[PDB]
Design a protein around this ligand. Structure first.
Ligand SMILES: Nc1ncnc2c1ncn2[C@@H]1O[C@H](COP(=O)(O)OP(=O)(O)OP(=O)(O)O)[C@@H](O)[C@H]1O
Ligand SMILES: Nc1ncnc2c1ncn2[C@@H]1O[C@H](COP(=O)(O)OP(=O)(O)OP(=O)(O)O)[C@@H](O)[C@H]1O
Ligand SMILES: Nc1ncnc2c1ncn2[C@@H]1O[C@H](COP(=O)(O)OP(=O)(O)O)[C@@H](O)[C@H]1O
Ligand SMILES: Nc1ncnc2c1ncn2[C@@H]1O[C@H](COP(=O)(O)OP(=O)(O)O)[C@@H](O)[C@H]1O
Ligand SMILES: [Mg+2]
Ligand SMILES: [Mg+2]
Lengths: 502, 502
């Protein structure tokens, strides 16, 4: 017909909400039952709910369904809003007096239902009157659509009202293959599509898209081929789309439920060099855990705690372990995002991020500098307890319906966490130490191209008896080489800086 | 007549509210008494109150009852609501002036009465005027309905107003047997029901349903048999519902006052293995307490405390004991449900859960992580006292009218509870210890299919002289084997991890 990827949900809606309307009234009256009058559809935006609604009605040959938007009714003036509802059902009322039980079916779609409860009452009560009360109207069927089931009051779900509930999901590979078929049919049937375009490849590149995003991608590719000829010209009849156009268009549409590439890549990495054996061990353990949470069904929530002193490398490690994983979904919470908001806004932001992470097969989250998110200052001490409780609950909840995620977190204030007794949330702890021998300094000098061997040797020979057992980090070590490089006397300057830091 | 299960109740209502209306006016005048003008019915929703109201009306062949809804009147504009109440009684006023004492009876129904008091006064005063004051009308009888008696002000219950009060209950096995007949009459009497459907079985499976759920169950079963023909065809005349349809329909309707199966089963239990004698003792004691509660009338409340270190197994034991009991009603209160709410909302939620527990023959409740529900942080220390007092009162109250329930609660901060002085609530305490011997580790490895015994011997030998006094929980032990399994060198990795944890 038109819909794609939905094959166990088009059977289950049709079995219950619609099957009885086909038969003549005699047999339905014969058994002694009643038609259902409410159906609820829930799932993330852009996934095809309104489509199913409109498309089913063409089989029954009902009237074109009316549509009403929640916030519209809520933003109208009080009296106008009150009168509006009684306007909506007028045609349905008339036809019943006209033809009794043999009237046709009428469909009403109610969108963004949750908005009414998010605080209103008059709309809800008037609406329930028309399908539950003594003024019962036996022609109508009302469809509701929401992204959040938990905000609707339980009173509405009980038998007689919104009796059947269905859930829509993001598509998998076979779904996307069918959606591509549906969207490119009309191009294919008119010899306006090249022969190198292979749809099974695109089905695998577009990893976590919804249907709407696929519409947008096709439109973009068409755009390229149009622009290639304008400046409106002869020989339009030879127009065609090509594989290169799809590959170019893939760089202009970025999906929600994707990878926050720029923040991870640029902000958190400006080098990476293996200067010791501990580093290598840390990156191997990271790979082990990524593999564990992709090939086992008895581990759907792992949490880790990379601790260490300041200037030690922590965050750059977390990022490095994530970018090599290849998961579809990756995000991070850091102080840069929460700047300038009130406390309540912060709670809302964290909660929404976690809810968005429970809608893909695989997920990674990074939490950076746990103590700064809580506003810790030791003169008081002062901190925010509400945020702490939100985080403490979140780090132990398990995603529903055989999904899975991995979490990584970074801190420099281990003792404070020990004091706040939230140290049982973590499954394992990794330690990151500083540099403490001159061999590491030699390695770091070599891989940054500091200067020729003749000078390098002299730096080590002078520090050998200037300061034998220094204790410095990596972040500071790379800001001293960089500044010393620009001096007029590089060896002496570097020696002085190193001695001061140690 | 048309209703079943509610017999006794009837006998009474008819004895008091209506018996006087049958007799001729002369004898009633002759005794020197006056009719009753108010009747209150209360009980859980969907249990059959409005049905009784209508069906009694048909025996006395009075007019069709009028109906009004509380929220409807309360939400309307102030002036319209004030003018509205006077419209409702107009017809009754007219017939009185027409025909005096010999007028027929008028019956008015008022729904969701408590909504008026839950905060209003104008409707209450105007209503009492017509049935108590000087302007009394002697034709009317008013029926009220509420789910909550305790909220109604006492001024209404005194003689002359709402003089008779009655309660409706959820049916027992015999009642459900009757309700199935009343609902399936029209199918049975027209040869559209198979010869294998046995109603005594269905009455026994549907353990805690109300009437509305039974209507829904029949409707769903009809839907199965109907859909099996379409795609609208010939031989509609051979339609028949069958036993398999009922058994499959049983999985689509879930009742309130049922079992929260998914939450108990998936989240809280992902393995169970009897690695020591203490575990067997714990489970045996749980079974003891269960069948105690089922076979005694001198123990209608029992409360338990399970305590021990973090990671020891607690919550899984609790859920494991719940699943094998076989009770109809099971729920749990845990931090996940209360996340994101304000304080007042949390209190309301807890209180409603306890109220819903007091309406079934048998009940179990599970309360998880008592110290996290109160928001304890030891720096202050800071915590919420209101929630603590609510929980402290609730754990001692006994349910009414020969019902019984069992409570289990789990915690990791035994010293804190001792400081807060709420140990007096619990009847007995159970201790869950950690692992402390190598034999237990051997059993766990055998049970989890780690690797062939040849390698298994080596782990125990190496730990026998590396660290013989280790002290770790079961959760950590089951998350270290899992990660070691995926390594390239599984023995050394597991040995190192165990040494670190101890
Ligand atoms: N082997 C390495 N491991 C980690 N970081 C490295 C390595 N080699 C170079 N670097 C660079 O060193 C810097 C380390 O700074 P980074 O922000 O990761 O430290 P940090 O301890 O998280 O800092 P802070 O806690 O003060 O915010 C980064 O620019 C990183 O790219
Ligand atoms: N004999 C057993 N006893 C307890 N848990 C077991 C047993 N065998 C396997 N398990 C598994 O071990 C895990 C125990 O974790 P659980 O959440 O019950 O611990 P907990 O004491 O509640 O932890 P926490 O204090 O961190 O909340 C569960 O996944 C459970 O299925
Ligand atoms: N599963 C799907 N199969 C085919 N087309 C789809 C699908 N999902 C989305 N589309 C396309 O995207 C458009 C927008 O989807 P829409 O029905 O508005 O979803 P929502 O109800 O979430 O807004 C549809 O009109 C259709 O062209
Ligand atoms: N004891 C019963 N026997 C038969 N049918 C019942 C019974 N109780 C409830 N029902 C069915 O449930 C339907 C809904 O009940 P309703 O009249 O709304 O009662 P209430 O709303 O007061 O719970 C009724 O129309 C009736 O068909
Ligand atoms: Mg950092
Ligand atoms: Mg627990």
């Amino acid at each position: 017909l038109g819909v794609g990827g939905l094959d166990k949900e088009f059977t289950k809606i049709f079995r219950r909400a619609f099957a009885s309307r086909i038969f003549p009234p005699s047999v339905i009256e014969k058994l002694g039952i009643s038609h259902v009058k409410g159906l609820l559809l829930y799932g993330p935006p852009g996934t095809g709910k309104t489509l199913i609604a409109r498309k089913i009605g063409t089989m029954l040959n009902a009237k074109e369904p009316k549509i009403v938007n929640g916030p519209e009714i809520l933003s109208k003036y009080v009296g106008s809003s009150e009168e509006n509802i009684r306007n909506l059902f007028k045609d349905a009322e008339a036809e019943y007096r006209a033809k009794g039980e043999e009237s046709s079916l009428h469909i009403i779609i109610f969108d963004e239902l949750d908005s009414v409860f998010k605080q209103g009452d008059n709309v809800v009560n008037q609406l329930l009157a028309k399908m539950d009360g003594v003024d019962q109207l036996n022609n109508i069927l009302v469809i509701g659509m929401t992204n959040r089931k938990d905000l609707i009051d339980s009173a509405l779900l009980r038998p007689g009202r919104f009796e059947v509930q269905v859930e829509i999901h993001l598509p998998d590979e076979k779904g996307r293959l069918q959606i591509f078929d549906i969207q490119t049919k009309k191009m294919r049937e008119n010899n306006m599509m090249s022969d190198d375009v292979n749809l099974a490849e695109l089905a695998a590149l577009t990893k976590n898209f919804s249907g709407a995003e696929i519409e947008g991608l096709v439109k973009s590719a068409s755009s390229f081929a149009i622009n290639k000829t304008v400046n409106n010209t002869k020989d339009i009849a030879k127009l065609k789309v090509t594989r290169e156009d799809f590959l170019n268009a893939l760089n202009d549409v970025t999906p929600a439920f994707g990878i926050s590439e720029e923040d991870l890549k640029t902000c958190v990495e400006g080098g990476m060099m293996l200067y010791s054996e501990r580093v290598n061990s840390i990156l191997k353990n990271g790979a082990r855990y990524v593999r564990q949470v992709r090939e086992s069904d008895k581990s759907r929530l792992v949490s880790l705690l990379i601790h260490g002193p300041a200037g030690s490398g922590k965050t750059a490690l977390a990022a490095e372990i994530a970018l090599k994983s290849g998961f579809p979904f990756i995000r991070l919470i850091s102080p840069n995002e929460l700047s300038g908001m009130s406390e309540s806004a912060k709670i809302a932001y964290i909660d929404n991020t976690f809810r968005d992470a429970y809608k893909s097969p695989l997920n990674i989250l990074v939490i950076d500098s746990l103590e700064t998110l809580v506003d810790w200052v030791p003169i008081g001490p002062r901190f925010s307890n509400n945020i702490l409780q939100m985080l403490k609950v979140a780090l132990k909840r398990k995603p529903p319906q055989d999904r899975r995620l991995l979490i990584m977190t970074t801190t420099s204030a281990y003792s404070v966490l020990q004091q706040m007794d939230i140290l049982s949330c973590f499954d394992n702890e990794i330690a990151v130490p500083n540099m403490t021998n001159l061999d590491e300094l030699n390695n770091v000098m070599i891989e940054s191209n500091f200067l020729d061997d003749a000078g390098r040797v002299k730096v080590i020979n002078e520090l050998s008896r200037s300061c034998p057992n220094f204790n410095v980090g990596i972040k500071k070590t790379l800001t001293n080489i960089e500044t010393a490089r620009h001096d007029e006397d590089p060896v002496n300057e570097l020696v002085e800086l190193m001695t001061q830091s140690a």
